[PDB]
Ligand binder design. Structure first.
Ligand SMILES: CS(=O)(=O)N1CCC(Oc2ccc(-c3c(C(=O)NC[C@H]4CC[C@@H](C(=O)O)CC4)noc3-c3cc(Cl)c(O)cc3O)cc2)CC1
Ligand SMILES: CS(=O)(=O)N1CCC(Oc2ccc(-c3c(C(=O)NC[C@H]4CC[C@@H](C(=O)O)CC4)noc3-c3cc(Cl)c(O)cc3O)cc2)CC1
Lengths: 354, 371
């Protein structure tokens, strides 16, 4: 309903990446609701249009699956919802209240995008018989689609959580979804506790947790950073589940399981979190498969965990020793000014892969 | 008569390089190298293979040397390395019409390979000196030059593969009355004790560290033989290659540990774990040397990157990684800034999985050198 014209226009622009510190500025006394509106009514169409161009480059057999068609229809509707605001007055508190409601509607509409897109890959696999693990097009696309999705969810969450007028705010000292004083070990313990509750139900034994902090500059100081705790939680929950599953499965006896050891290091540039297990490990040749969408989980926990780490210029790396165990390391930027969004952009480089 | 490969001359070298460059290098498995020792009737076979294969490998990489930017190619050190490769190619071409049935041909061939090995002994630092000549003349940081980085990885991996073929022939067939390591098949130890190679590399790095520093970290080794916990870990490998990797990693771990503990006489130890799985032999070296931020790891594997006691020559760590890759292994670094660094050597546990990784001169390679 005009959609191809809007997609074409907004696709020409590059997404504009923000630092964690710029997110904080948008949610502070340095900015207001009008600033967030004028930014987002341009930025959300650019990001929606850029990924919608890439969806339309998928092989026709993937594009025509019911679930991919459903996801494409949501993106089209969300783009048109934001177009209603392009000529509205930012000075008018009605415009701003209507915009917040439109973003809440979009967030609800897109809530199940991750499993719905995964269902479309399975529909493709179960119809045509091509293993999506081995299809490099689908793997390349899903990394960029899911990173795009994380970036759009971050923009919408920041606006709706800050400008809600949220009656009783969950975590009242957060700036939207950002904790400017995130205690990293508390997020580690919370992710471990949730993984331990699941592991106790299904195995009747879980490895213990051991945490060590190294604050290079200030030995005694409990480590804090500016981060989105839900993103950190998602990564650590996934890593704990895998380390606990490997530890339990590789041990004859559930009586004396080796613990999972976590080290949190704060350097000048990096906040590093290493999770070490004695779960028997993975041969080097098979590490790549663990980050493959829908490999032998719902098929996406570990690759999406790695996208959350990449999103603010971090990484998630696995280093295994077959016959012994596995180290997983989350690398985050220590400084909010270094934590800049990593966004896929629709360009010649992207086009080539498809 | 005046056939292309007859009465070879310096003047003819471009034509010979063109001819041999049309063939692909033929990769051998560690298992095939073991077979080619098992009888001295294998000497004729080694000769007939090597008088074709060494010209092919020489010619393939010589094509890429000639694609270097003019200002790198013209350096005296690069010209020197290219002149050695040309002479070595001509030396082997003298054998193309000679009779393998004549024991004189075989003894002359072994002498010619020993001459070549001696001539090429300093190729690694000479090539590096040419890149430095380029850097120090033009002020282009070779770390950031993707052409030079691409070339050096392929050049040094080619060099490793040539040295392996020459070592296998000369150490099996030279007929040393009482040989140094009598249980080896050329340079291959079919019962390589990995911990002993770790201890030898540690001892040599500690000798160097004790020269410059008042203290050096101790060594701790742990073994996990998954299938047989009581069995000391052994594998089929080339122990000199494993030594070169472990020497480089010990030097770096010792340098980091000392520099982060400036006036300490009691240092955190360097811990090594050797794990044997069904597919992988993994060696992890762990230090408490204060670590490297993630953004700077890529630089450590860049040719001619520097931050001379245990300082680098610009190639130790990337060439260590080429030794791991040469038989389908790898060398990976993972650091934790403010704590320390883990380096992991991954080797194939099975001699049949250990196949030479060789660069081949093709259109794909040619493209990389194009503006
Ligand atoms: C696409 S996904 O995100 O949905 N997906 C990825 C996660 C996967 O589950 C797992 C879990 C654990 C393990 C595992 C083993 C182990 O299990 N070895 C035995 C065979 C494992 C496969 C096997 C093969 O594939 O052939 C080859 C060795 N050992 O160490 C780990 C390990 C892994 C991670 Cl990632 C970790 O963080 C910590 C660990 O200790 C492997 C796989 C299901 C789902
Ligand atoms: C191209 S080469 O192969 O010739 N070669 C050059 C010379 C050598 O450099 C080295 C050695 C050690 C270290 C080092 C530090 C450290 O020293 N941090 C301090 C930073 C401060 C300036 C920083 C920068 O900005 O570059 C970068 C180091 N901490 O952990 C390690 C470490 C490294 C390796 Cl590889 C390892 O195996 C074990 C280790 O503990 C860094 C660099 C290798 C690479």
């Amino acid at each position: 309903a005009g959609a191809p014209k809007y997609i074409e226009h907004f696709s020409k622009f590059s997404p504009s990446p923000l630092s964690m510190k710029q997110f904080l500025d948008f949610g502070s006394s340095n900015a207001c609701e009008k600033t967030s509106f004028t930014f987002l009514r341009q930025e959300l169409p650019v990001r929606l249009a850029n990924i919608m161009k890439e969806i339309n480059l998928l092989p026709d057999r993937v594009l025509s699956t019911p679930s991919v068609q459903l996801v494409q229809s949501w993106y089209v509707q969300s783009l048109l919802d934001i177009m209603e605001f392009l000529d509205k007055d930012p000075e008018d508190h009605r415009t701003l209240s209507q915009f917040t409601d439109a973003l809440v509607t979009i967030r609800n509409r897109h809530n199940d995008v991750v499993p719905t897109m995964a269902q479309g890959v399975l529909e493709y696999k179960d119809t045509y018989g091509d293993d999506p693990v081995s299809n490099q097009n689908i793997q390349y696309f899903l990394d960029r689609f899911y990173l795009s999705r994380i970036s759009i969810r971050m923009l919408i969450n920041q606006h709706t959580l800050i400008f809600d007028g949220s009656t009783n705010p969950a975590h009242p000292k957060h700036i939207g979804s950002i904790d400017p004083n995130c205690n990293v070990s508390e997020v580690v313990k919370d992710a471990y506790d949730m993984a331990k509750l699941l592991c106790d139900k299904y195995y009747m034994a879980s490895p213990d947790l051991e945490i060590q902090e190294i604050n290079a500059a200030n030995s005694k100081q409990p480590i804090h950073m500016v981060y989105v705790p839900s993103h950190l939680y998602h990564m650590l929950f996934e890593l704990f589940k895998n380390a606990m599953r490997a530890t339990v499965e590789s041990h004859e006896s559930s009586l004396i399981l080796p613990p999972i050891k976590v080290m949190v290091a704060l350097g000048e540039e990096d906040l590093s979190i290493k999770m070490s297990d004695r779960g028997g490990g993975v041969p080097l040749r098979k590490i790549e498969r663990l980050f493959s969408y829908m490999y032998s989980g719902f098929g996406y926990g570990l690759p999406i965990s790695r996208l959350y780490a990449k999103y603010f210029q971090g990484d998630l790396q696995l280093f295994s020793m077959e016959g012994f165990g596995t180290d997983a390391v989350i690398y985050l930027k220590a400084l909010s000014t270094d934590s800049v969004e990593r966004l896929p952009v629709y360009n010649k480089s992207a086009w080539r892969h498809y």
